[PDB]
């Protein structure tokens, strides 16, 4: 018959799937307290202005307040991140692609080599005028003092390396040409798949590769181009991952990891 969440967990437990590629979005960051990027406040021509360069040049204060909130150290990873961390620790993670900019994937312990922050990061920054690169730390203070970072060379605005609309995606994104054909399982956690070219990556896997979606809604290419080995665990993203963790037998090992990695951060 058709594949179920239990059948995919059985495939993982049997080690039939060992090249898992994961795609994640805001659905896995909202349970950690990350605010919705469309509904601010925890100045909008349209919701996407916060990540649009012309507005940013008109008024960059809204983006830099959002950053002061999302900059590392404030929020902390949740169960979904530590599940993916466990996938990596067990040698099953080929690569984790994320649309999120909170850095919680790195904080959960996933090494940068196994991670593709496809929509940029606050760890680096670039001057909007002369393109001079800068370490993300070199501008941290300015954002905490509610300032606007400025280039020490040309006085232009320095922008964290968050990929804005219209901007190219980082170069580590181009690892998708080799990873997705090499994947034997595709997990899609908490994303509406409305942003391209990220969303189109669901189709970059082979039709013999299962695609498991844990998201409140069946969204995007999985709804209009369904495949035989597609599985959809619709509902809350945390409960869906916890159901998969139980079906995998990782509940207690998770409970150990979540308590030890959290206390490490005091």
């Amino acid at each position: 018959g058709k594949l179920s969440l239990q059948d995919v967990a059985e495939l993982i437990r049997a080690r039939a799937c060992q090249r898992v590629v994961v795609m994640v979005g805001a659905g896995i960051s909202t349970p950690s307290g990350i605010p919705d990027f469309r509904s601010p406040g925890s100045d909008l021509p349209y919701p996407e202005a916060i990540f649009e360069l012309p507005f940013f040049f008109h008024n960059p204060k809204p983006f830099f307040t959002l950053a002061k909130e999302l900059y590392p150290g404030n929020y902390k990873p949740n169960v979904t991140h530590y599940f993916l961390r466990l996938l990596h620790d067990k040698g099953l993670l080929l690569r984790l692609y994320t649309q999120n900019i909170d850095g919680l994937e790195r904080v959960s312990g996933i090494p940068a080599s196994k991670l593709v922050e496809a929509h940029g990061t606050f760890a680096s920054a670039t001057c909007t005028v002369c393109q001079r690169p800068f370490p993300g730390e070199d501008i941290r203070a300015d954002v905490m003092a509610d300032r606007v970072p400025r280039c020490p060379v040309c006085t232009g605005v320095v922008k964290p390396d968050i990929v804005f609309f219209g901007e190219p995606l980082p170069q580590r994104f181009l690892l998708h040409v080799v990873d997705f054909p090499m994947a034997d399982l595709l997990l899609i956690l908490g994303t509406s798949l409305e942003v391209e070219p990220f969303a189109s990556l669901t189709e970059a896997v082979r039709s013999s590769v299962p695609r498991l979606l844990i998201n409140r809604d069946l969204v995007g290419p999985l709804a209009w181009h369904p495949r035989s080995r597609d599985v959809a665990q619709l509902g809350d993203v945390v409960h869906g991952v916890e159901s998969l963790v139980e079906l995998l037998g990782w509940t207690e090992e998770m409970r150990d990891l979540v308590q030890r990695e959290t206390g490490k951060l005091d």
Binding site: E48, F164, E167, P197
Partner: peptide
């Protein structure tokens, strides 16, 4: 089609 863009 390598540049970030929303469906709309």
């Amino acid at each position: 089609g390598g540049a970030k863009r929303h469906r709309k």
